[PDB]
Amino acid sequence: NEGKALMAIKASFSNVANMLLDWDDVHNHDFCSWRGVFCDNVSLNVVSLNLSNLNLGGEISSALGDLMNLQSIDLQGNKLGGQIPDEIGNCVSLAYVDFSTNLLFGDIPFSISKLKQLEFLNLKNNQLTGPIPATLTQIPNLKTLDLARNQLTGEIPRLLYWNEVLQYLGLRGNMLTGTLSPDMCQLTGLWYFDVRGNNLTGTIPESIGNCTSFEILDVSYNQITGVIPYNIGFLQVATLSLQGNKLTGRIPEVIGLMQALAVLDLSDNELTGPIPPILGNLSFTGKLYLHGNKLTGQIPPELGNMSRLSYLQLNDNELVGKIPPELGKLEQLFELNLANNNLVGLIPSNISSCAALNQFNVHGNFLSGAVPLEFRNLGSLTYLNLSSNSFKGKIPAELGHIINLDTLDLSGNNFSGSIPLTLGDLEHLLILNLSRNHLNGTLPAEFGNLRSIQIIDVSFNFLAGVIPTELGQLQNINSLILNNNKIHGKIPDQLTNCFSLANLNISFNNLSGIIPPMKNFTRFSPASFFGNPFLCGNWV
Amino acid sequence: PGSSPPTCKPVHVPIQPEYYPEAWRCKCGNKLFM
Known part of the structure; x- marks a missing residue:
């Protein structure tokens, strides 16, 4: 039945x-x-x-x-x-x-x-x-x-927190107001506490440390305020995710002794004060995310002692000082994000010793000096962003043999000398931004070999010579920006064959000739070509 | 005051329900885990 x-x-x-x-x-x-x-x-x-x-x-x-x-x-x-x-x-x-x-x-x-x-x-x-x-x-x-x-x-039911049995508590994503109650540490069998993405308010309970049964504690992306309590240092947590809250105060030094941490995330908070050097002893942690805060101070070399660390993100802070070379001890380092800080000094020649190093991002700082050549030993380098700095010297030709490069950003600098021909051999390159620099020399033609390129920017430089005619080969290029250079000669007709190219700017040169209108090249007539005197068109 | 990892050969694993939150689990060369 x-x-x-x-x-x-x-x-x-x-x-x-x-x-x-x-x-x-x-x-x-x-x-x-x-x-x-x-x-x-x-x-x-x-x-x-x-x-x-x-x-x-x-x-x-x-x-x-x-x-x-x-x-x-x-x-x-x-x-x-x-x-x-x-x-x-x-x-x-x-x-x-x-x-x-x-x-x-x-x-x-x-x-x-x-x-x-x-x-x-x-x-x-x-x-x-x-x-x-x-x-x-x-x-x-x-x-x-x-x-x-x-x-x-509505709030989290207070009586639920009193359960010895409960193991997995996943509330991630709802809109639950209320605060973390200290009764949270009366869950004696829970190993996963997940309140992320709620409208939660309140503070971290001071009894949070008496929760040795917790392995993953994720309170991220709520409106929780307060300092990070001392007791946080007793947690047996494997993953501790505190990012995206309004926590103030400094970073408790006692988290140094928390080696059960695999992933420690404190990002997007309002934390201030220096980076605690004691953090050098959590050598089993894999991810350290400290970005988006108000942190001051220097970069302590003790972070080179975190052997099993693969992702270091310190961006969007107020740090100062030189880049320490002891990061060259980080033979398992993958991502280094130092963006939007106030660092000065050189890029250390001992930093080219972390083979596995995909992305390297130092945009938005005050670095000086030339570019070290030993970057040629980073074969797995897929992302290189050095924009908005004071780098000098020629572009090392050795940057062309880092074959899997996908994005190369050198804008906002003082780079000089002609463009290396060896930049032609990045087949997997998509975005090449050389803009706002001081480049000498003419425009090299091997730019035809960037099959997958989408965005080329050499604007605001001193390039000379004629617009290369091979530039019609790139089918994946949607933006071609060559503003404010000394480029002369005529406009090649082959510039029509760029199917994906919907965004163009070649104004402000000595460009001569007509505007070739093979395809619908009337969308980029008026604005794209404005600054050229010898160009056939109705403008000054 | 502090913490320390386990000793079953130990390793740390993502559990997929943004990235994955990692928890401690010990596997030897054999693809097991405890």
Whole structure:
């Protein structure tokens, strides 16, 4: 007779008639062989139900209340709709509920409390509204509660924090006001505490340190204020994510002794004061993110001692001082982000010792001196941004053999000398910005070999010679900017074949001839060519 | 006052539910984890 409820369950469903392998009250009265519905060996009644990821796009019918021996329901990924019917509060045998990646709205029924055996509730990726029903600490068996990526409201129920059993608490993405209660450390079995993306206010409880059972603590992207307490230094956390809050004060030195940290993120906060050198002893941490803050001071060389660190982000701060060469000890370094600070001095020649080094970003600082050549030992270098600085000397030709370079940004500097021909051999290059510099020499032609290039900018330099004629080869180029140079000769007609080129600027030169109008080159007539005297067109 | 990693060969793993939050889990050469 549970087959009847299975039919009504099938009735208000998606056009499943497709994949539901034969549920029917016509002939087959054996509903323990049907697709996705499992019966136990003993009494032949439904125990487990796996309809996961079938795109059955219906509503959850009320007849679910009639399936009594039902223990586990997986309706995940079926694009299902409606709310969760109240009558689910019937089957007390229910244990596992996965409504993941569906489209369900409305309040979570109060009847959910009537399921004593229920230890796993996952409602992530749904449209459910309402609050977190306070009647959920009534369920004694609950270990995992995942409500992440929904729209729930109201504070976090205070009584829930008193549960020895709970293991995974995921509230990430809702709009939950209220504050972190100290009762948070009365969760003695929880190893994942995830309140990120809420409208939460308040402070960090001072009792946060007495939570040695926590492995991942993610409070990021809320309105939490206050200092980072001393107690934070007792946490056995593997990942500690404090980024994107309004925390003030300095960085507690005692987090130095927190080597269980794998990922430490303090970014986008309002923290001030220097970088604590003691952080040199967390040699097992992989990600250090400190950017977006008001941090002052120098870069302590002790960060070279974090052997297992791969991502260092210190951008958007107020740091000063030279770049220390001890980062050359970071043989596992991948990303170095030092942007929008006030650093001065040279780029150390001992920094070319971190082979695995994808992105290097020092834009927006006050660095001086020439560019070291040993950058030719960084073969895996995919990103190089040195813009808005005072760099001198020629462009080292050795920058051409870093074959996988995808973006090369040298703008805003004092670079001199002609352009290296060896810059032609970056096939995977997309964006080459040499603008706002002091470049001598003429314009080299090997720029035809940038197949994937999208954006070329050499504006505001002293380039001379004729506009190269090979520039029509680049099909992926959408922007060609050559403003304010000494380029003469005529405008090559081949500049028409740039299919993707919708953004052009060649004004302010000694350019001669006509404006070739093969294709629709009338969109870039007036403005793009303004500053050239010997150009045929109606302007001064 | 402090913390220290575990000793089962230890390693730190992403768990996929932006980046992934990493937790401590020990695997030897064998692809297991505990």
